[PDB]
């Protein structure tokens, strides 16, 4: 089950959605359970990954991955909400690009061993689940690098929401890969 443009629905019991503008080399591959593969390189803007929709206020995410990125890529659990329409990550690592870099500091939070700076950005009539909008990004970035392990959502929920950074009704919720103009593979196994 290898995808050949953008594309969503659910695979062995886990939700998948892949985004891409199409450019570039990438060939995004469905696996048993919850796992994909992806290899990807050229001038591509993608972002896909498996988990769950609508995502949950308490899921505890546990997933393992085989990650080398080559330039601007992230490894993140990601998700939308809507009302209001808010983008998420939570990044557990990323390639040369630190996607906190200029963003508003909201403080940090501490969980499943790792210790994660909270940020506020936003993308002003960009694409989204919506359509093109203008809507707020939150962040929470891993101070330390890592490609597997347990991520207990109900943390940073609650560490974004206190630090006055509200959350809408929970679209989709996925560990995704994600790359601008970079190169690379990814192997993620969710569950
Ligand atoms: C830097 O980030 C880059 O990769 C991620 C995307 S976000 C992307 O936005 C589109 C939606 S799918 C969308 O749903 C609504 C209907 S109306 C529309 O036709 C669909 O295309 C994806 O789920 C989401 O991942 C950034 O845009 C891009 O810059």
Redesign the pocket.
């Given at each position: 089950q290898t995808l050949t443009s953008?594309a969503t629905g659910t695979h062995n019991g886990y939700y998948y959605?892949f985004?891409t503008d199409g450019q570039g080399n990438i060939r995004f591959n469905l696996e048993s359970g919850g796992q994909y593969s992806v290899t990807w390189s050229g001038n591509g803007?993608?972002?896909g990954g498996k988990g769950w929709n609508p995502g949950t206020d308490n899921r505890v995410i546990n997933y393992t991955a085989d990650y080398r990125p080559n330039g601007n890529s992230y490894l993140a659990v990601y998700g939308w909400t809507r009302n209001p329409l808010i983008?998420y990550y939570v990044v557990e690592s990323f390639g040369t690009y630190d996607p906190s870099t200029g963003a508003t500091r909201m403080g940090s939070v501490t969980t499943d061993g790792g210790t994660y700076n909270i940020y506020r950005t936003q993308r002003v009539n960009?694409?989204?689940?919506?359509?093109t909008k203008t809507f707020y990004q939150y962040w929470s970035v891993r101070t330390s690098k890592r490609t597997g392990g347990t991520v207990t959502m109900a943390n940073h929920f609650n560490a974004w929401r206190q630090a006055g950074l509200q959350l809408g009704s929970h679209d989709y919720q996925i560990v995704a890969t994600?790359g601008?103009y970079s190169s690379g593979s990814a192997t993620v196994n969710v569950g």
């Open positions: 953008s959605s985004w803007n993608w972002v983008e960009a694409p989204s689940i919506e359509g994600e601008y």
